[PDB]
């Protein structure tokens, strides 16, 4: 099923603001069920043709997985050099700098919010982290409170 | 009143205020009539709150925001034609950014900030960020409304 439309609008807006305000080239959010299973994937910074070429959506593997069990923020300067990295699939843009956070409400997990490749070639900042966390928290509020499906 | 909602709305106000680096931030939630249902804020000391006495009714620029729900971003709130004025003992405030707190179906209130640091006006960036936070608040309110 498609995401509830208000939830989707809210999540795309949160991803866009996060991406813009930390000056990331790419931004993404995975929306999960309560068991960390990826349900939806919201992103920006990649053109449609490149999206078609990559083909398959992410499974929430590699570095992204770390955000789920160690729910504190993670910054890396060369994300795919991390030993948990699965690697980029064919056609995916190479990415180096990373800032990622879990999306939570209290102790419930709702997904992940992560950004890559700060445009000045610089590492993500402390201020960037704090902002990203606040956005994630807002995202957790949206997902937790989102309208559940209803038959006509 | 609702305590877990109230705490959610306060967290959103805190996020808007601190991230934009405003001195003051508020959210007002109204009924279909416009009776206030929630008014949460930060940046003003309890002593000044008592001095003001009466709660806002949602007039002036806020009223405008209720009437025409779209972002409103001003160098000087007192200079807007729809400005009603501050009551006695209210802290002076000058720069203003307000956005609706809403979902597609309905708008429930207004999230608003004043007096960005160093006397600077609120930016487009600030406005977009506040809209994103407000939207999350809008979902939380909608969910609460859904109570029978
Ligand atoms: C635009 C925002 C995006 C960001 C910030 C992002 C970031 C990342 C990162 C950091 C990794 C893993 C590095 C590692 O652990 O090896 C990854 C892997 C991956 N990405 Fe992306 N990516 C984005 C967009 C996309 C899109 C649009 C697609 C597909 C349409 C995609 C498909 C994949 C796949 C299949 C993997 C392999 C790991 C997995 O299955 O989870 N990505 N991405
Ligand atoms: C701290 C966050 C606050 C902000 C950002 C804020 C801002 C504002 C603004 C922008 C106006 C409209 C001015 C105009 O239209 O000319 C206003 C008016 C008003 N304010 Fe505040 N305010 C805050 C807190 C308070 C508090 C704590 C109270 C007292 C309980 C209060 C009481 C009022 C009253 C009575 C009005 C007159 C208009 C109306 O009734 O809605 N304000 N304030
Ligand atoms: Ca540091």
UniProtKB/TrEMBL annotation, chain A:
It is found in: Cytoplasm. This is Oxygen sensor histidine kinase response regulator DevS/DosS. It comes from Mycobacterium tuberculosis (strain ATCC 25177 / H37Ra). The chain holds residues 63 to 209 of 578 of the full protein.
